[PDB]
Amino acid sequence: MMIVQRVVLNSRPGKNGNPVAENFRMEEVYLPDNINEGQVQVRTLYLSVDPYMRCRMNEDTGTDYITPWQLSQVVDGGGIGIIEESKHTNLTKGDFVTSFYWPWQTKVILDGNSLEKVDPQLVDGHLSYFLGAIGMPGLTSLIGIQEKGHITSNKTMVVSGAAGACGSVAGQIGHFLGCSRVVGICGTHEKCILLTSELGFDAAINYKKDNVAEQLRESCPAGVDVYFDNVGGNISDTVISQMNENSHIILCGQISQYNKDVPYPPPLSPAIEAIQKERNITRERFLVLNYKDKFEPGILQLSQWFKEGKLKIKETVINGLENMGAAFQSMMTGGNIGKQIVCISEEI
Ligand SMILES: NC(=O)c1ccc[n+]([C@@H]2O[C@H](COP(=O)([O-])OP(=O)(O)OC[C@H]3O[C@@H](n4cnc5c(N)ncnc54)[C@H](OP(=O)(O)O)[C@@H]3O)[C@@H](O)[C@H]2O)c1
Ligand SMILES: CCCCC1C(=O)N(c2ccccc2)N(c2ccccc2)C1=O
Ligand SMILES: CCCCC1C(=O)N(c2ccccc2)N(c2ccccc2)C1=O
Ligand SMILES: CCCCC1C(=O)N(c2ccccc2)N(c2ccccc2)C1=O
């Protein structure tokens, strides 16, 4: 048997704690030499890190559709790989495949029925895009905007988490689908420049260093019609206060709250909820997995926009399975521009 590397959950940060690289531990394990009928042996190429993973580090995730990671057991998440051996009738050696529950391990034996075969032509061979802009975050942005944005209209969109995986795509799609103005809120001036100089955002606001309320008044002079919310907390309170009658909050995530012992989705404060109700602002829970029937058209559209040169795809790649923990910590504290990716093998 050959020896491979895996990542297991080492320790929990606590419900109110910050996640750190040391919450994960690398181990070496044997990979069995044979696979059974219906299984495939896959070489892991890229793995995702994602904000939802924070709740998987707690003993109770607080959400009925996410299971907690278990101490000393292999971690899992979005991944893409290449089939090395197959005893599944619909998969063969050399196929590229994806799973939402890919073990954090360099080579894996999986049930073939749990994988989706993907076409590398859709990403011009850049496979890591299947974990970002031509993957779940891209789909979340496109389907979120389509289903919850009510964009036809010379509307103004605000995007929080604007320079992240979802946000960087959302702001571009807002322009593609008819917003006249798209304004981004993010955590660094470097990110602000990216948004306006490369991604076509009309304005960018650094929430750490800028006065968010007054910058939104200057950059959104006609108020806010659509809010693509990745962050929640005080930032969302500030945006909501400038939202128009009959506007829409695309409630994508609330990452400002993930290191706190509070339920998801978190309620708005009494003052901000009052504004929401008075202005008839809609704020419905959005779960991209409720729209799996739209993933095909979504991916095909994201791909087409990419290939046309319209959709600009940004990512931050760290190399090596040993860096999964560091990549997660980095993403959670804003180290990533666009999608955080970990490259697990050589790009061939
Ligand atoms: N509803 C769904 O089906 C669905 C699907 C996918 C993702 N989501 C949600 O979408 C959001 C974005 O996920 P992603 O994968 O695109 O991650 P991401 O935006 O690429 O990475 C997270 C970013 O969050 C920002 N951040 C971290 N802590 C913050 C804080 N306290 N306040 C403000 N910003 C903070 C950081 O950028 P800064 O430098 O700008 O702080 C960091 O780069 C998350 O809330 C996630 O749960 C939802
Ligand atoms: C409690 C986290 C809040 C937003 C959250 C969500 O419900 N999903 C989410 C939806 C269904 C199953 C699992 C998570 N994911 C998510 C992350 C990456 C890709 C897709 C969805 C999210 O980040
Ligand atoms: C997308 C890859 C497979 C994920 C699959 C799943 O595990 N959950 C899921 C997780 C736990 C319990 C039930 C389903 N749901 C799901 C569907 C809609 C909304 C939320 C989750 C899914 O679609
Ligand atoms: C949450 C994942 C559950 C399976 C899921 C998948 O990963 N892809 C999928 C593959 C690559 C990127 C994003 C999703 N698609 C999918 C996409 C387009 C057409 C058919 C299927 C899927 O339905």
Pocket of ligand 3 (CB under 6 A): 65, 100, 287, 289-290, 292
The contacts of residue 251 (CB under 8 Å, 6+ apart) are 148, 229, 265, 283, 284, 285, 286
Given this structure, which CATH class describes domain 134-312?
A: alpha beta
| CATH top class, domain 1-133+314-348 | alpha beta
Helix (H, G, I), strand (E, B) or coil at 231: coil
- Among protein residues, the one whose CA lies closest to atom 15 of ligand 3: 289
Please name which of 233, 276, 247 lies closest in space to residue 158, comparing C-alpha atoms.
Answer: 247
Distance from the alpha carbon of residue 253 to the mean position of ligand 1, in angstroms: 7
Which residue's alpha carbon is nearest to atom 14 within ligand 2?
Answer: 52
Method used experimentally: X-ray
Residue 12 tokens, joined: 């929990």
Mutate to test the pocket of ligand 2, among 285, 288, 328 (most ligand atoms within 8 A of CB): 288
Ramachandran angles phi, psi of 333, nearest 5°: -110, 20
Q: Where are the domains of the chain?
A: 1-133+314-348, 134-312
Cis bond upstream, residue 267 (ω within 30): no
Both tokens of 315, joined, read 């990512």
Residue 2 — φ and ψ, nearest 5°? -90, 160
- Is 286 labeled as ligand-binding? yes
In the beta sheet, which residues pair with residue 86? Answer: 40
- Nominal resolution in Å? 1.9
296 by Cβ neighbours in 10 Å (0-12 / 13-18 / 19+) ranks as exposed
CA of 286 to the centre of ligand 1 (A): 15
Q: Are 212 and 205 in contact (CB under 8 A)?
A: yes
Instruction: Say how many C-beta atoms besides its own lie within 10 A of residue 229's C-beta.
Output: 28
Quote the CA–CA distance of 254 and 215 in Å, as a whole number: 22
Residue with CA at minimum distance from ligand 2 atom 1: 52
Q: What is the C-alpha separation between 346 and 238, in angstroms, rounded?
A: 45
What is the rounded distance in angstroms from the CA atom of residue 339 to the CA atom of residue 342? 10
